[PDB]
């Protein structure tokens, strides 16, 4: 009943925020890989930092994927 | 940023929920060990049932503890 559903809802709210953060990391990747191509020749400094940031978002995005799989598994166990 | 802070708060709310279930399961396990020592070799059927309950709580607890670390580390990664 109510208390059980609440616990599942906490997990759902977390999933939904992490999924939102994924989507935003994907838009950022795309901005960064676009900027690195844009600056490749005329601004090597900006390009190189774009690529470091892209890699950092890629890593953050991986941690988030693993957190989601963990959340889903915990939530199934409670359902 | 704002998105990270919202995600970080929903992670905190999940940790709080998880710690409450953790404390419930830990108590239940303590209670089963205490009862197993008192009851001893009095009744095989009841002992087997109790060993089954204790194993279920231990399995649920191991899951909860794994989820909690994962959520904690994800939160720290967004800060």
């Amino acid at each position: 009943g109510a208390m059980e559903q609440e616990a599942i809802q906490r997990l759902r709210d977390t999933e939904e925020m992490l999924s939102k953060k994924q989507e935003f990391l994907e838009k950022k990747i795309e901005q960064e890989l676009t900027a690195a191509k844009k600056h490749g020749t005329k601004n090597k400094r900006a390009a190189l930092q774009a690529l470091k940031r892209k890699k950092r978002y890629e890593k953050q995005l991986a941690q988030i994927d693993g957190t989601l799989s963990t959340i889903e598994f915990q939530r199934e166990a409670l359902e």
Side-chain angles (χ1 to χ4, degrees), chain A:
Chain A
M3 168 155 157
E4 289 77 48
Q5 283 323 297
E6 323 283 15
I8 278 58
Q9 186 71 46
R10 304 288 76 75
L11 292 164
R12 294 249 181 86
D13 291 343
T14 299
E15 288 176 299
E16 301 190 322
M17 285 304 318
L18 295 176
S19 293
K20 183 164 174 189
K21 172 68 171 163
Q22 294 210 302
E23 292 172 37
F24 279 74
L25 284 168
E26 292 164 330
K27 289 163 175 142
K28 274 282 168 300
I29 286 300
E30 152 176 39
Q31 278 176 309
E32 302 296 9
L33 182 65
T34 305
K37 314 283 202 103
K38 183 103 183 300
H39 296 309
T41 89
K42 295 291 147 193
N43 193 338
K44 286 169 276 205
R45 179 116 53 167
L48 183 45
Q49 283 294 146
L51 292 172
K52 298 192 178 189
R53 287 196 306 274
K54 174 196 178 282
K55 181 181 173 181
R56 178 174 91 234
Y57 303 146
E58 281 160 352
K59 177 185 179 176
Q60 289 172 359
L61 169 150
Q63 176 160 10
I64 302 270
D65 272 341
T67 305
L68 286 168
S69 297
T70 294
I71 289 306
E72 164 66 1
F73 182 72
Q74 187 61 78
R75 166 198 107 223
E76 307 289 73
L78 287 171
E79 279 174 14

